[PDB]
Design a protein around this ligand. Structure first.
Ligand SMILES: O=C1CC(=O)N(CCc2ccccc2)C(=O)N1
Ligand SMILES: O=C1CC(=O)N(CCc2ccccc2)C(=O)N1
Ligand SMILES: O=C1CC(=O)N(CCc2ccccc2)C(=O)N1
Ligand SMILES: O=C1CC(=O)N(CCc2ccccc2)C(=O)N1
Ligand SMILES: [Cl-]
Ligand SMILES: [Cl-]
Ligand SMILES: [Cl-]
Ligand SMILES: [Cl-]
Lengths: 293, 291, 291, 293
C-alpha cells in the first residue's frame, strides 16, 4: 500500500516579526538551506515520494516558486492552502482528496531530525498498515508539547496537549503516520477550548481504540524545533558543526533522492550545474565521484 | 546641507544558494530582524532620513513590501533597480538623479556596526561638508577588503582593492560619506570588470580630500556575507540583546530617539506587533528612560 | 595618590560542579585565556598596577602558579585567602593592610567588559580622588544584581540588592572605585548572612559621595557565572578576536601599550609561547602599529 | 575474556596556552563537565570497567585528585605517567603490565562521541577477541588524521598518518580495540620521521597481517575532537543544545554506571548528596525516580 506525505507549513502569525515580514518562516534558512528542506528530507527518508505542502495563502506560492512539482528530485509535490490557522488537524480535511484512500504521514514544517539509521527507524513505522504511529522523545520542557504518559510496563495510557502539570517528560514529536481512518477521525472532532482542531485529539482517538503505536526516539537522536528566534539559531549552529566536521550535509534533498535511486547520476549532474559556482553545487558534484558508506 | 543615503542591497548571485532561493541575502534575518535593518539603522544614526535602496528587479518589491516608503519611521525611502551586478561604484550612476546636488552616504546591505556613542562617531563624518570620509578597522583577513596603508605619522598614503599582499591589517568598512563630486568621479572598469568603490576613494585621496577615521577595536564591524558569518553575527546580536534587554538596530526605536516620530506614532507601530516580543519591546520603550 | 586593586576570585561553592572539581571558576577559560585575565585587564586599563587577588586556600596556589608576582607584566600582585564566602564586602577586611591609606578598586573575578575608549571611561572614575564610583548598565534581569533607581533628573536616589521587584533595569556592574573611607565603612550582615557591597555603596550614597556613571548600550558587560553564560561569553570573545585579529584582555599587550614593560621584555614573554597562537600574537605586536 | 581500557590524556604542550597554564587540557570543561568524562563514558559504554589513565607527570595527580580509584562509580581506575610526548603508541609500553595478557581498548582523552545504540555499536568491536578494530568516519579535513583507503569492494587496503594528499575522506577515530598482540607490535616499532611512536603504525601492523577490522561510524554519529580553542567551544555548544533540549546529560559517568548496574540506587543517591545544591546533583537525584527509555 502507498503512503502519501503532508508537510504542514503554517503561518507562525506575527510571533517572529519582523524577520518573517521579509520571508515566511519555513523559508528561513537553517544554516545553509531553507527550513522546509528538513521536514521534506524526513518524508523522503521514510520512502514517501508523493507530498502535499500546506501553508497560508501568502506563502503557498512561495513554496511553489521554490520547489516546483518535485520532478527534478523524483518527487511528486502538490500544494494546498490553509486560510486560517485553525489547528494542525485541519490538514486532513484540506488534504482529504490528496490522501484519497491511501495511508498517510504528517510532518510539521519547522521540525528537524538527526541521527543514525534514520532510514530504518522510520521503516518500521511506515510499513505498519494499520492504526497510527508516533514517536516519543525525552525533553526538558514537556509543557510545550503533546505529552505521553506510560504505565509501569511502558504502555501508553494518556496523551495531553500542553499540560500545565505534565505526567512525563516524553513529548510527541512532529512526525505522524496514519492509516485510512484519519480523515474520518478528523471530521468527527470538536474544537478544543482554544478554538483549534488538535492533532493530539486525532492521536487520542487512535489511542482509545488501542491502535496507537508509540515508539521511543532515543537520546541518541536529535529532534529540534525551529519555532523561536533562539531555537532557530541553535539549530543553525548544530547543523553547521555537523556539516563542517563531516563534509556531509544534513537534509540535502538532491542527495537523498540520488541515494534512494529516485534520480540518477546524469540527473544529479544537471542539478549541480546551475549551482556549480557555490559550495552546495560543488557538494552535489563531489557526490558523483565519491563512495559514502 | 542635506545628506542622502544609499543602501546597496544587490544580487548575492548563487553564493548562498539554496538558502537565498527563498529570498535575497539582505532579507535573511540576523537573529531577530532582517539583515537590511542593520545598515538602515546605521544611516539613521548618522542623521540621514532620505534613503535610496538599490536591489535586483526581483528583490525590489520584497524590500518595498518590508519597508514601504519609510513614512511610518519618519523616513523617505525610494527604490531603484540594478539589472546587473557591475560593481559597487555603479550605485552613483543608478543613484545620480536621487542624489542631485546633495551630499551622500553609501552603505553596504550586509554590514553591521555596534559600539559606543555610534551616533556621535558618525556625526563628525556626516557633518564634514567637503571631501570624502571612510572608516578603517583592524581585521584578521584584510585581503578580502579595500586596504588602507598609513605612513609613520598615521596619514593614509595608499588604498588597494583586495590585495593578495596587504600593506596593513586596516580594512575600509562598508560605510562611505561623499560630497557633491562623487557622481562626476564615478562617471569617469577594473581588471575584474567592475566599477570599484576603491577607485572612487583613491580619487579623493589623490586630491587630498579623503578623511580616513579609525574605527577602534572597541567597535564591532561584522560582515554577514557567508553562511558561517551570518550565523556568527546572529549569535553576537542575541548575546547582546538577551544580556541588555535592549535591541540592536531597531529602526522604530532609533526614529523615536532621534525625534523623527513621537510617542503616539510609536504606540501605533507597536499595536500590530503587540502579540510578539518585538511589539512588546516597542511598547516598553514608551514607559522607560534609557540613558 | 596611588590606587590599589582587588580581584575577588572566591569559591564558586558547588554551583558549577563537576566542571569546577577540576579548578576554581576563575581559572576556567573564556575562549582562549583564563577567566581571571579579563578582570585583571580591566584593573590594568584603569591604570592600576598593585593588585591583591583573594581566593580560597585551595585556589590561591593555582592563581599564584598562573600569575606569579606580576613583575613580568610590570605589575605587583599579592595574594590573600578567604577561608569562608561571607560576602563581597569582606574583601576590605581581608584586604585592609594591603589597602593601607590608599585609594582602592574592587572587581569581581567573573566579570568581563568590552567596548570603546575603555581606558578613558575608567580614567574619569580612577582619577576621582574622593567618594566612590560605580557603573550602571541596562540589563534584562536586574533582579540578579544591585539595582540603582534614578529620579526624573537622572540622579541616583536608591540602591537595592537583588530586589524581587526592581525599580529600574539598571544593574550596578562588578567594578567599584573607593576612597580612603571604605575600610571603615566596611567594618561597620544582611538577612542572607553576608557582608554586602550594596550596603557599602549605600553608605556613600547617603553621604552624597556616590558617583554613578552610565555604561552605555554600546559596551558589553558579561557575567561568566553559569555554564550557559560562560559558553556565550566564549563565543562572543571568539567572534571579536577572529574578526579583528586583535585579542581581548591580553595582559602582556595591555602592559606594553601602557608602557609598563618595553619591547625587549615583551619579546622575552613571547619566546616560551612562540609555538602557539598566543605567542605568535605577542610577537606580531612588536612589528605592527595598532591605532 | 576481559578487556581493559586506556585513556591517553597527553600533554598538548603549549598549544592551548595560556588557558592550559591554569588547568590541564583534559580537565577543561566541555559545557558542564570535564573533558575527560567523555572518553571515560565511551569506555564505560563498551562495557570496560578497568581503566588506566595516562598523562603527564604534572597532570596525573590532578586526574587522581578528580577521579580517585573509580570505586564510587563501580570502576577500577589506575594511573601512569608519560614523561615525554613521544607518540600515542607509547601507551602500550607504559601500559604493558596493566594490560598483562588481556584484551585492551585505547581512547584519546580529547575525543567525544554521540549517537544512537552506541552501547551496541561498540559491542560488536568489544566482543571480537582476535585482531584489532577501529572506526572510520567521514570528515572534511582528512589531512589532520589517520586516513583509511578502501578498494572498490569496501575493503581497507591502506592507512596513512596525516597525508598531504589523502586517499579518502575517511578518518580513523580516536577509539581502538586490540587483542593480546598489541604490546609486542608496539615494542617492535621504529619511530616515524617526526620522532614519534605512531598509533597508525600499530594499526598498519594489524592491517598487513589481515587482522584489522575497520567499521564505518556513520553520518548519524557525532565524533568531535576538542583539541583547539575553536573546536572546544563548538563541542560545548553542541553538548549544551542536546542537554537543554532533552533534559538528559551526555557522558555522565554516574548515570552510565547506574544504567549498567555497576552501582545501585542507594549508591547513586549517596553520590547525588554532595552535589544536591547544583543542577548536576539534582539531575542524579531525578534519575532515581524516572524511567528513561
Ligand atoms: O540528512 C541525511 C540523513 C541520511 O541518512 N542520509 C543518507 C540517506 C540514505 C542512505 C542510503 C540509502 C538511502 C538513503 C542523507 O543523505 N542525508
Ligand atoms: O542599535 C542602536 C544603537 C544606538 O545607539 N541606539 C541609541 C540611539 C540614540 C539616538 C539618539 C539619541 C539617543 C540614542 C539605538 O537605539 N539602537
Ligand atoms: O582588551 C583590550 C582593550 C583595549 O582597549 N586595549 C587597548 C589598550 C591601550 C592602552 C593604552 C594605550 C593604548 C591602548 C587592549 O590592548 N586590550
Ligand atoms: O552519554 C550517554 C550515552 C548513552 O547511551 N547513555 C545510556 C547508556 C545505557 C543505557 C542502557 C543500558 C546501559 C547503558 C547514557 O546514559 N549517556
Ligand atoms: Cl538512542
Ligand atoms: Cl576603541
Ligand atoms: Cl553607548
Ligand atoms: Cl548513520
Amino acid at each position: 500500500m502507498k503512503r502519501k506525505g503532508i508537510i504542514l507549513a503554517g503561518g507562525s502569525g506575527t510571533r517572529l516579526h519582523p524577520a518573517t515580514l521579509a520571508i515566511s518562516k519555513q523559508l528561513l534558512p537553517v544554516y545553509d538551506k531553507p527550513m522546509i528542506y528538513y521536514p521534506l528530507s524526513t518524508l523522503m527518508l521514510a520512502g514517501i515520494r508523493e507530498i502535499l505542502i500546506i501553508s497560508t495563502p501568502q506563502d503557498t506560492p512561495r513554496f511553489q516558486q521554490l520547489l516546483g512539482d518535485g520532478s527534478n528530485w523524483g518527487l511528486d509535490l502538490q500544494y494546498a492552502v490553509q486560510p486560517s490557522p485553525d489547528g494542525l488537524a485541519q490538514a486532513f480535511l484540506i488534504g482529504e482528496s490528496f490522501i484519497g484512500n491511501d495511508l498517510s504521514a504528517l510532518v510539521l514544517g519547522d521540525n528537524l531530525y538527526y541521527g543514525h539509521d534514520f532510514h530504518e527507524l522510520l521503516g518500521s513505522a511506515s510499513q505498519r498498515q494499520t492504526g497510527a504511529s508516533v514517536f516519543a522523545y525525552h525533553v526538558l520542557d514537556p509543557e510545550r508539547y503533546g505529552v505521553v504518559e506510560f504505565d509501569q510496563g511502558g504502555k501508553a495510557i494518556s496523551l495531553e496537549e500542553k499540560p500545565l502539570e505534565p505526567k512525563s517528560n516524553y513529548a510527541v514529536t512532529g512526525l505522524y503516520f496514519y492509516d485510512q481512518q484519519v480523515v474520518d477521525i478528523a471530521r468527527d472532532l470538536k474544537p478544543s477550548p482554544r478554538g483549534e482542531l488538535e492533532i493530539t485529539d486525532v492521536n487520542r482517538a487512535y489511542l482509545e481504540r488501542g491502535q496507537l503505536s508509540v515508539e521511543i526516539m532515543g537520546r541518541g537522536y536529535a529532534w529540534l524545533d525551529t519555532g523561536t528566534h533562539d531555537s532557530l539559531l541553535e539549530a543553525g549552529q548544530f547543523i553547521a558543526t555537523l556539516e563542517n566536521r563531516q563534509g556531509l550535509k544534513v537534509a540535502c534533498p538532491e542527495e537523498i533522492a540520488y541515494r534512494q535511486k529516485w534520480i540518477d547520476a546524469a540527473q544529479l549532474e544537471k542539478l549541480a550545474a546551475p549551482l556549480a559556482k557555490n559550495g552546495y553545487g560543488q557538494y552535489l558534484k563531489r557526490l558523483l565521484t565519491e563512495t559514502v558508506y
